[PDB]
């Protein structure tokens, strides 16, 4: 289904 | 100083080095 799971590294906001 | 990281996101790998906030 639409969901945006994709690999993310520790970036901090 | 922070690396404030979130619209233009400048990093490498993927991979999840510590456990903050963004490990996948």
Same mark, same amino acid.
């Given at each position: ?11 901090i906001? | 100083? $922070? $690396? ?6 400048? /990093?490498?790998?993927?991979?999840? +080095?510590?456990? /903050? +906030?963004?490990?996948?």
């Open positions: 289904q639409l969901y945006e799971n994709k690999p993310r590294r520790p970036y906001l | 100083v $922070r $690396r404030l990281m979130f619209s233009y996101i400048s /990093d490498e790998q993927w991979t999840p +080095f510590l456990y /903050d +906030f963004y490990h996948y």
